[model samples]
Target: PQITLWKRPLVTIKIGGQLKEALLNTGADDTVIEDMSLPGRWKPKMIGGIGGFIKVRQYDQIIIEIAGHKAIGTVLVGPTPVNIIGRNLLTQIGATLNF
Candidate 1:
């Protein structure tokens, strides 16, 4: 599906059986979510952004549904300002960016 880019391209996504809003960020390499109770063992890792770096719990093989389309992959759980759906999951959903 085609989605337009705005200051923040927000979309509804389901994760861990809960619906939440997430930003579709082409700049981000991985999907990052706010602190949540997610099942499975996670490895500690650090991710860098425009500001600095943040420590996150990397949960593998997470299923995230965006606009009824399901995409399974890794998701980072941490103290993020907002939930971000990056290119890692976007490509799986056949999402195309429009300028």
Candidate 2:
């Protein structure tokens, strides 16, 4: 299925049995989400952003459904202003950039 990228390029995704809105960010290397009580053991790591580097909980093998497409991969949980779906999961859902 073809999806149009809006100005914001936001999409509905389900993570940890909760529905949330996420931005499709091609510039990001990995998916990032706001703080949530996800089940699993996470490794403490630092991630760089526009402001600077911040500590995050890196959870491995989490399943997230984007537009009905299920993608399982690493998810970084922290103080992100917005949830982001990066290239890792985008490729899994067959997503391509179109002007």
Candidate 3:
């Protein structure tokens, strides 16, 4: 899909046998998802953004799939305004932006 500046690019992401929509955000450095139920262990971590950094729980090696491409990597859990698929998984999914 050719996405224009007028619209936010979103794609269906599947994790833990559940599907959800997330922004295909290229600007972020890592994948961040809204707080939800998942059984796993996590460590306290801080992620930098707009003006500063905030702490969140980090879960590692989680299974995630976009469309059909599958990747396993770190995920941040918190109360983010929106779920995002950042460069971490973007590279695995071979996502590219073209004008």
Measured over all alpha carbons after superposition, the RMSD of each candidate to the real structure, in angstroms, is 1.4, 1.4, 1.8
What do the candidate models score in CA lDDT, each in turn? 0.91, 0.91, 0.84
How high is the lDDT of residue 25 in model 1? 80
Candidate 3 off by > 4 Å: 1-5
- Of candidate 1, the 10-residue stretch with the lowest lDDT total is 1-10
Ten-residue region with minimum lDDT total, candidate 3: 1-10
Cα lDDT of candidate 1 equals: 0.91
Off by over 4 Å in 2: 1-6
- 4-95 per-residue lDDT for model 1 (tens digits): 55456788999999999999887889999999989999999999977999999999999999878999999999999999998999999887
Give the count of colliding residue pairs in each prediction.
0, 0, 0
- Error (Å) of candidate 1 at residue 67 is 1.5
**TM values, all candidates:** 0.91, 0.92, 0.85
Candidate 2 lDDT by residue in tens digits, 1-99: 556754788889999999999998899998999999889899988989789998889999999999889999999999899999999899999888776
Q: Which stretches of model 1 miss by more than 4 angstroms?
A: none
